[PDB]
């Protein structure tokens, strides 16, 4: 048993609270600098937000450990603001240190932080607009759909994913009653075309099994016939011996395929489509011979995928070929083989207007590195509109809001006073750091920047202006088109305040001898 002083721990707390908070401070936004991950494998990786780098970074102190825990939630709901809470945590916390170094209870001021949260939250609740709407949000989408695709993989903002990503949301947004999930929409990374090659699908796209193109490539109807079972003679995606007794019996063998093509074709068709995903992969022969005979079937399929298309259709899979049902086939408002990539076979596009609980954006990329970085890019703008569709409210922030919410709380300190007064004072300065800390990452004096809008905040409060996160000569928010769902910042307000509280949790600083051991 080795018990240390909470102070000493508070050191190890604050000693952990720095580099992670620091990590963002020159990494904040595009004016921030990239975050490199080199692995236990020694693998160089350029990383982003907190949670990307935070999980990749191997957490050591309880804070570091607690970081990723807290940090995930902001990217979950909001998609953005993950980088901020870690900055915000230490910023206030490392003064809370200094405050406790004044001989101040963590006890007493942290309430004031919890309490100044709300009044900044409420000050936040003043900021910007309470509303976005289906056509409205699109431009604020386009705003963020700029900066989200104007950030990671390209800064170009292809309006492709910019308005493809929102549509999947906009498609599943209303579906969930003003809600969405990112299974319910999906980023489909598959290459074969560049970033500029993307798609939005109402369902699954799979590269359609063909054992020969001349044996007809046929897609039709709107419907897929979903089968765990054969549409052409089965096989468990493994080796199988095909033998015949005499020279002639090889010909009768294909008849069996040929008949059980149509026998399954005629069986599975009447129950809908002709297109039957067959989890069973087959030898070259019957596949193309059915492609020949009629109505291609999809073979060599992921058990998840026959399941994925089913749950996408909201109906089932047909498990048994002796069995069959229409619900156990596909509900799809379109099924079409469509040329997939520039490099490979036509994908089978199942876009489900019969039943789709999931509407998936598809992305090609010229590399995995870029198609993943775009895959990495999207979820953010995907998640911010997830906030929007539930609450369409956004806040101009990043140098408008921090110093704004800090100013009232700076004033609230003097209204409130005692333990909350140096809470709400220190509560505020942490906010004002982030826009400051952007000119940190940016090329500008972080002080005089914060000073700048500090003058502007004295001038005007909750401005459509702000700092320059894009480092434009104009320091704006509206015309920076920087903004966040007022969900997010508030949600982002919660977390560090949550965590700087969580370091206070109850009492116990004793261990068995094992705390980090």
């Amino acid at each position: 048993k080795s018990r240390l002083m909470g102070l000493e721990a508070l050191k190890s707390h604050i000693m952990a609270a720095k580099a992670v908070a620091n990590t963002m401070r020159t990494s904040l936004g595009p004016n921030g600098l990239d975050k490199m991950m080199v692995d236990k494998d020694g693998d160089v990786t350029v990383t982003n937000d907190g949670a990307t780098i935070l999980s990749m970074m191997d957490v050591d102190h309880q804070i570091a450990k607690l970081m990723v825990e807290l940090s995930k939630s902001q990217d979950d709901e909001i998609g953005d603001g993950t980088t901020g809470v870690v900055v915000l945590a230490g910023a206030l916390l490392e003064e809370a240190e200094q405050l406790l170094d004044r001989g101040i209870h963590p006890i007493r001021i942290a309430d004031g932080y919890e309490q100044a949260a709300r009044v900044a939250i409420e000050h936040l609740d003043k900021i910007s607009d309470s509303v976005l709407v289906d056509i409205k949000d699109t431009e604020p989408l386009i705003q963020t759909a700029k900066t989200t695709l104007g950030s990671k993989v390209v800064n170009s903002c292809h309006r492709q994913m910019a308005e493809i990503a929102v549509n999947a949301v906009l498609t599943v947004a209303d579906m969930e009653r003003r809600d969405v999930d990112f299974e319910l929409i999906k980023v489909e990374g598959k290459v074969g075309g560049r970033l500029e090659d993307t798609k939005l699908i109402k369902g699954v796209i799979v590269d359609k099994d063909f054992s020969h193109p001349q044996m007809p490539k046929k897609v039709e109807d709107a419907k897929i016939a979903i089968l765990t079972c054969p549409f052409e003679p089965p096989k468990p995606k493994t080796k199988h011996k095909l033998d015949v007794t005499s020279v002639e019996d090889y010909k009768a063998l294909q008849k069996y395929e040929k008949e059980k093509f149509e026998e399954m074709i005629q069986q599975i068709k009447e129950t809908g489509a002709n297109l039957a995903i067959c989890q069973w992969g087959f030898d070259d022969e019957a596949n193309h011979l059915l492609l020949q005979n009629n109505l291609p079937a999809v073979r060599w399929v992921g058990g998840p995928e026959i399941e994925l298309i089913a749950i996408a259709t909201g109906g089932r899979i047909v498990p048994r070929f002796s069995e069959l049902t229409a619900e156990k086939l596909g509900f799809a408002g379109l099924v079409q083989e469509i040329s997939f990539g520039t490099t490979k076979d036509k994908m089978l596009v199942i876009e489900q207007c019969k039943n789709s609980r999931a509407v998936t954006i598809f992305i090609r990329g010229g590399n995995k590195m870029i198609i993943e970085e775009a895959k990495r890019s999207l979820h953010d703008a995907l998640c911010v509109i997830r906030n929007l569709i539930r609450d369409n409210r956004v806040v101009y922030g990043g140098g408008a809001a921090e110093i704004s919410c800090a100013l009232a709380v700076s004033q609230e300190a003097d209204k409130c006073p005692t333990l909350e007064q140096y809470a709400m004072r220190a509560f505020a300065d942490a906010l004002e750091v982030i826009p400051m800390a952007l000119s940190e990452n940016s090329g500008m004096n972080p002080i005089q920047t914060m000073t700048e809008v500090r003058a502007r905040q004295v001038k005007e409060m909750n401005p459509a202006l702000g700092i320059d996160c894009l480092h434009k000569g104009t320091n704006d928010m509206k015309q920076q088109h920087v903004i966040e769902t007022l969900i997010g910042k508030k949600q982002q307000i919660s977390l560090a305040t949550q965590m700087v509280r969580m370091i206070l949790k109850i009492d116990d600083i004793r261990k068995p001898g094992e705390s980090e051991e």
Binding site: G103, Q411, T418, I447, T451
Partner: protein, 513 residues
């Protein structure tokens, strides 16, 4: 370089480190000190105020401190500790800024911006009181006096300071009655009750012997002529190889001087201030013995101090040789007075002296010097607080709580300044709240409760109200029976605004060689 960086911090190191334990400020707080010095001693020390003047601290930023302390005395007469208690207050804020990396000269004028508005917020919390008014003069001095070492004699001491001023004061509103005007003159014997307020020039010098002139028609002046005689100012050809040659000049020496002191008293001199210069003699010991036979007040090689007051107050001029008679440039004096009270002390009082309308001489008496000095120090803050009223009209608080009253405000003033300085001044604007706890601090155990809540209390008392540091409890400190003229506190900012800012200037170090 690192040296400019470190030496400032090293200057910030020493001076700040001193100013902290320099705050037990006031109170009956913290345990008494012997002091074993830097080169060694045992120095039993008490009352940081005098200790501040006693303080020898030697280090580039330490020397400005002793200065800083002594100035607020001559600036006010009060707040001697108070200028330093806000010194380390400034010395902290600089760090976080230089820790924020803010430029020191940008930090420098922030002190002005702090001093500029700070005195106005002090001027705002200043409760203006009349500088010529007996009551405000009484009451303000009374707060000092009731806090001084004699709160009893204070009743007799304040009207003296009130009347010392009002005589010396320029009529109606005035910045007047300096401590140069006031001549505080001790007199052995008498009583503190017998401490006397004389409007005129009383020179503290000890009159030769007694039974001399107490009568009217003095002539006092500093006379730089000497009394000639054989073997005094006058030529002799006679080397002494014999006893008679030794005696002959003496018989002519004392007689001729005896007829010179007549010319002095013939001049009308009931006093002379003898030049500190001599040749062989100047005025001899027999000469003074002869001058005192003629009732001429004489003090041989008179202290240079009473030399100046008689030239300052009366306008005394050099005087012609006594064989030339005089220029009658002895200052105008209608009274040569030697007072003896408790049968003790010899005190020249020149009354009817030429006086500007200023130069009160408070005669300080007592059964002992310690008895003398109690009121003498007490009546001084009776003088000075009133003088602080005269020099500046207001009653603020004492004790440093109204600093927190400036602190809540000047914070927002920075917050309104909205500059980099708004961060620079504000970092101090709150950091000035430190003193009331640091007054309390140096005594005991179980520390924490009062410290943080003090600034909180006043903060909850907001701008108009706060906790009284001396009397405790939350009530507006400006009028308590804890009070000061605002002159006291504003100078503390001024003095500290600069000497501290002077450290911001230092880059690296030199030593004149």
């Amino acid at each position: 370089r690192d040296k400019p960086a470190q030496i400032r911090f090293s200057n910030i190191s020493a001076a700040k480190a001193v100013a902290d334990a320099i705050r037990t400020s006031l109170g009956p707080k913290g345990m008494d000190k012997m002091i074993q010095d830097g080169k060694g001693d045992v120095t039993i020390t008490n009352d940081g105020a005098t200790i501040l003047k006693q303080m020898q601290v030697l280090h580039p930023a330490a020397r400005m401190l002793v200065e800083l302390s002594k100035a607020q005395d001559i600036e006010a007469g009060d707040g001697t500790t108070s200028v330093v208690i806000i010194a380390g207050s400034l010395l902290d804020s600089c760090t976080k800024l230089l820790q924020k990396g803010i430029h020191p000269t940008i930090i420098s004028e922030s002190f002005q911006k702090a001093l500029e508005k700070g005195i106005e917020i002090l001027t705002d919390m200043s409760r203006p009181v009349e500088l010529s008014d007996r009551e405000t003069l009484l009451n303000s001095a009374t707060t000092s006096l009731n806090s001084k070492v004699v709160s009893q004699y204070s009743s007799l001491l304040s009207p003296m300071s009130v009347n010392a001023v009002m005589k010396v004061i320029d009529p109606a509103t005035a910045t007047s009655v300096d401590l140069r005007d006031i001549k505080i003159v001790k007199k052995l014997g008498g009583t503190i009750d017998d401490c006397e307020l004389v409007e005129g020039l009383v020179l503290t010098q000890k009159v030769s012997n007694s039974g001399i002139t107490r009568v009217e028609k003095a002539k006092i002046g500093l006379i730089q002529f000497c009394l000639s005689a054989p073997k005094t100012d006058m030529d002799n050809q006679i080397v002494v190889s014999d006893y008679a040659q030794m005696d002959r000049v003496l018989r002519e020496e004392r007689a001729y001087i005896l007829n010179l002191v007549k010319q002095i008293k013939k001049t009308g001199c009931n006093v002379l201030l003898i030049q500190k210069s001599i040749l062989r003699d100047a005025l001899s010991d027999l000469a003074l013995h002869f001058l005192n036979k003629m009732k001429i007040m004489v003090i041989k090689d008179i202290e240079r101090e009473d030399i100046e007051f008689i030239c300052k107050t009366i306008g005394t001029k050099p005087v012609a040789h006594i064989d030339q008679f005089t220029a009658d440039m002895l200052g105008s004096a209608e009274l040569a007075e030697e007072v003896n009270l408790n049968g003790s002390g010899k005190l020249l009082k020149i009354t009817g002296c030429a006086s500007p309308g200023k130069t009160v001489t408070i005669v300080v008496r007592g059964s002992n010097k310690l008895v003398i000095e109690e009121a003498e120090r007490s009546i001084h803050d009776a003088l000075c607080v009133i003088r602080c009223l005269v020099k500046k009209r207001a009653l603020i608080a004492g004790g440093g709580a109204p600093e927190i009253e400036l602190a809540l405000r000047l914070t927002e003033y920075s917050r309104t300044l909205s500059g980099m300085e708004s961060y620079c001044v504000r970092a101090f604007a709150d950091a000035m709240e430190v003193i009331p706890s640091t007054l309390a601090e140096n005594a005991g155990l179980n520390p924490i409760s009062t410290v943080t809540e003090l600034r909180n209390r006043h903060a909850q008392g907001e701008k108009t109200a706060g906790i009284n540091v001396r009397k405790g409890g939350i009530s507006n400190i400006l009028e308590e029976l804890v009070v000061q003229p605002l002159l006291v506190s504003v100078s503390a900012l001024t003095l500290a605004t600069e000497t501290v800012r002077s450290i911001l200037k230092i880059d690296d170090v030199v030593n004149t060689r």
